[PDB]
Structure 1
Amino acid sequence: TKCTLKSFTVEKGIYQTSNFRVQPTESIVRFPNITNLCPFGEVFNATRFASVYAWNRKRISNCVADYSVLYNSASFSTFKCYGVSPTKLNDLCFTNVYADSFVIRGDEVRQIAPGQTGKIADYNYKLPDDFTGCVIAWNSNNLDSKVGGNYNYRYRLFRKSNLKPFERDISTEIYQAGSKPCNGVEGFNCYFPLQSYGFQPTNGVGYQPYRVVVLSFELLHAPATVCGPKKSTNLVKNKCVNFNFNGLTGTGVLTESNKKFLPFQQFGRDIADTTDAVRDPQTLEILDITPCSFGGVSVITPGTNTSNQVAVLYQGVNCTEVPGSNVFQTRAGCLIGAEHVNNSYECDIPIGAGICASYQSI
């Protein structure tokens, strides 16, 4: 009081010093049930993969996919992410995904990389230098390699030019290395552009078959498809907290409400555009929001010239959230530091709602 009045002495009366408000305790987030998972079991646990120059292409959109669980798996030899790190990949997302899967040798595992050149990198699969996405490779010697030789797999060896990024060519035309034309039969200057892999169970690391899947992403102006799932902590009521219900954020205290939302609304507001009720995306029940309590504080003093003990009034605040004497609850708020009597005298220092205080103690 002395500081607000900027004086060393105070006369009798009531003065307004500062304000008061409840502080939020913790945070909660609510999101609907996680379902419609993207089916990667048929991709990364597929029995058979295609050739390197005939790589299988899969389009991914309109589902939910979690990349943390895939990243945590130790069954993948190479997990190289270029555009983004695997940790933060679960947050950001794209409007479509392309998965290119094939099988190569273990010595060619680094051919599939931005700014990389080679036989496979120029004749079978090509990536842009600015490619964004991830590459996952894993040995499949016990599965893809055969004791009789995995000659089913094929690779492109001969081509006049290179391959454009994200281009697949399965043409089997007889390559013409020289100038001599060939009538569909390879000659001195003609060779088959395609050669079969020679995998065996015992061939060594580098010659072992390796399944490689490359995930690429694109962000066309279409609405966003699959993103990482969102966690949902449980809800707590009757406590001043801040909430993020499905993108609707705000502070307050949450209670049970008897309003009846018609089956397609999400939340309600009363007037002047202030939200009052919400519907939790999981339990599908109507809640109620009430702002956390606040109000000004005032000090009642008989004057520095007489005493030095004072009483304190919190305006419009229930006597349940106070933070050493008797406490009185009045229609004007809550009062601490003064004693309530049954008499009735002439009013000295107005307080309100028909009551007032005076000095005798206060």
Structure 2
Amino acid sequence: ALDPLSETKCTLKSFTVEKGIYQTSNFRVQPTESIVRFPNITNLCPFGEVFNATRFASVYAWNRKRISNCVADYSVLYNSASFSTFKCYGVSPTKLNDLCFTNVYADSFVIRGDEVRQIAPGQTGKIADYNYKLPDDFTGCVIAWNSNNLDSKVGGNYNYRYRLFRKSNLKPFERDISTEIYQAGSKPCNGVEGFNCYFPLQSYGFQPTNGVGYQPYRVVVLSFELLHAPATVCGPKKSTNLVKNKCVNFNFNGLTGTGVLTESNKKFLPFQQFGRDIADTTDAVRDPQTLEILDITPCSFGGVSVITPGTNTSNQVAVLYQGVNCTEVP
């Protein structure tokens, strides 16, 4: 790796080189930058309807919003810095920003502050056993919010209730609004208060002077579904600027290559993205942001030849870069 004369000796495996021309290695211009191009991030998804909502409901009358065919922006949700608890299992939300799933569900309810442990699979008690439960394979990420100045009212917010009892253990993701009566013994209730029959519905005592276990806490569950249908919702991505006349790396939506980008005199149809040659090689690509086609030309490469006389006479050599322009050698 010191002399082109000595590089010839490492290929011929000898200490004496006679007169002639020899090929030693190859020349290749290394890429400098990496161009990442992608289409726009339009057709945004209405995430403010469940996160920045004004209206809400109880723990048993929770609504359901369908999220599909949109872009899932989770960057502002992870760095929100305006919410109480953000804990979830296994999959961290900092790498979920560049993934794609099938369906996304988001709920809306307000629970007590001391009942925050009940929204978990395998938990028993008041809310998980009588109102609403989650299955064991829940891989989503929950999110809560304190609403001491939003949903609180003086005197008491008796417009919303929460169940204290139920007949048996409910199936996960159940939307039960009805008002069945709990029976304990062999005495039937017959829809009226009697022996061994307790009223499950208990009204809320939401007050601005309430404790930590009696304050309204807006908690939203968020679940992720992987189905055999093809994925429709995805995360966002960021592109860079466009560099011309340089052998760089290509990162398009469905193409990856290496070469330079110059102006093309061709005409493309609006029902096609890129073009190809007769030997299945790409030569022209369209920018997904602005409607302009760019030619794909590979940067220069070629073999290296060493012209030298015999070593018994002198030691001066000549280096010939075959097919390479010497504006690009230094």
TM-score bracket relative to the smaller structure? over 0.9
Alignment CA distance shift 1:311-1:294 (3 Å): same
Secondary structure of the residue aligned to 1:313 is strand
Contact in 2 for aligned 1:83/1:133 (Cα 8 Å): no
Query: How far apart, in 2, do the equivalents of 1:170 and 1:192 lie?
Result: 14
Contact in 2 for aligned 1:137/1:213 (Cα 8 Å): yes
Query: How far apart, in 1, do the equivalents of 2:96 and 2:22 lie?
Result: 57
Query: How far apart, in 1, do the equivalents of 2:178 and 2:258 lie?
Result: 63
Deviation of 1:102 after TM superposition, in Å, equals 0.7
**Percent of aligned positions with the same letter in both sequences?**
100
Deviations 1:289-346 (A, max 9, x none): 11121100111112212111111100001121013xxxxxxxxxxxxxxxxxxxxxxx
Query: How far apart, in 2, do the equivalents of 1:247 and 1:108 lie?
Result: 48
Contact in 2 for aligned 1:83/1:131 (Cα 8 Å): no
Query: How far apart, in 1, do the equivalents of 2:262 and 2:93 lie?
Result: 39
Query: How far apart, in 2, do the equivalents of 1:100 and 1:25 lie?
Result: 48
1:157: which partner in 2? 164
Contact in 1 for aligned 2:50/2:107 (Cα 8 Å): no
Query: How far apart, in 2, do the equivalents of 1:83 and 1:58 lie?
Result: 25
Query: How far apart, in 2, do the equivalents of 1:302 and 1:45 lie?
Result: 82
Secondary structure of the residue aligned to 1:90 is helix
Query: How far apart, in 1, do the equivalents of 2:297 and 2:222 lie?
Result: 47
Query: How far apart, in 2, do the equivalents of 1:11 and 1:300 lie?
Result: 11
Task: Specify which of 185, 189, 192 is matched with residue 178 of structure 1.
Answer: 185
Secondary structure of the residue aligned to 2:237 is coil
Secondary structure of the residue aligned to 2:117 is coil
Deviation of 1:181 after TM superposition, in Å, equals 2.7
Contact in 1 for aligned 2:189/2:195 (Cα 8 Å): no
Segments of 4+ moved more than 3 angstroms: none
Deviations 1:51-88 (A, max 9, x none): 10111222211001211211111111011122411101
Query: How far apart, in 1, do the equivalents of 2:116 and 2:275 lie?
Result: 56
Query: How far apart, in 1, do the equivalents of 2:321 and 2:273 lie?
Result: 37
Query: How far apart, in 2, do the equivalents of 1:113 and 1:63 lie?
Result: 28
Deviation of 1:191 after TM superposition, in Å, equals 2.7
Query: How far apart, in 2, do the equivalents of 1:43 and 1:238 lie?
Result: 48
Query: How far apart, in 2, do the equivalents of 1:176 and 1:103 lie?
Result: 27
**Gap runs ≥5 in structure 1:** 324-362
2:18: which partner in 1? 11
Deviations 1:266-291 (A, max 9, x none): 00001111011000100121001111
Tell whether 2:255 aligns with 1:248.
Answer: yes
Contact in 1 for aligned 2:27/2:302 (Cα 8 Å): yes
Larger radius of gyration: 1
Deviation of 1:216 after TM superposition, in Å, equals 0.5
1:49: which partner in 2? 56
Contact in 1 for aligned 2:71/2:234 (Cα 8 Å): yes
Query: How far apart, in 2, do the equivalents of 1:210 and 1:298 lie?
Result: 76
Deviations 1:141-189 (A, max 9, x none): 1111211211112111121201111111111123233332334321233
Secondary structure of the residue aligned to 1:55 is coil
Query: How far apart, in 2, do the equivalents of 1:54 and 1:83 lie?
Result: 29
Contact in 2 for aligned 1:19/1:296 (Cα 8 Å): yes
Contact in 2 for aligned 1:38/1:65 (Cα 8 Å): yes
Contact in 2 for aligned 1:68/1:86 (Cα 8 Å): no
Deviations 1:235-274 (A, max 9, x none): 1111111111112101111111121111111000011110
Contact in 2 for aligned 1:109/1:137 (Cα 8 Å): no
Query: How far apart, in 2, do the equivalents of 1:37 and 1:161 lie?
Result: 42
Deviation of 1:212 after TM superposition, in Å, equals 0.7
For these two proteins, the number of residue pairs brought into alignment is 323
Query: How far apart, in 2, do the equivalents of 1:177 and 1:148 lie?
Result: 34
User: TM-score if structure 1 supplies the norm length?
Assistant: 0.86
**Gap runs ≥5 in structure 2:** 1-7
Query: How far apart, in 2, do the equivalents of 1:282 and 1:218 lie?
Result: 31
**Which structure exhibits the higher relative contact order, with contacts defined as CA atoms closer than 8 Å and separated by 6 or more residues?**
2
CA RMSD of the aligned region, Å? Answer: 1.3
More displaced 10-residue stretch of structure 1: 242-251 or 180-189: 180-189
Secondary structure of the residue aligned to 1:107 is coil
Deviation of 1:213 after TM superposition, in Å, equals 0.5
Query: How far apart, in 1, do the equivalents of 2:90 and 2:203 lie?
Result: 33
Which protein is richer in strand relative to its size? 1
Deviation of 1:128 after TM superposition, in Å, equals 1.1
More displaced 10-residue stretch of structure 1: 131-140 or 178-187: 178-187
Query: How far apart, in 1, do the equivalents of 2:268 and 2:104 lie?
Result: 37
1:315: which partner in 2? 322
Query: How far apart, in 2, do the equivalents of 1:156 and 1:177 lie?
Result: 16
Contact in 2 for aligned 1:53/1:123 (Cα 8 Å): no
Tell whether 2:155 aligns with 1:144.
Answer: no
Contact in 2 for aligned 1:300/1:311 (Cα 8 Å): yes
Deviation of 1:228 after TM superposition, in Å, equals 1.1
User: TM-score if structure 2 supplies the norm length?
Assistant: 0.95
Secondary structure of the residue aligned to 2:39 is coil
Contact in 1 for aligned 2:38/2:289 (Cα 8 Å): yes
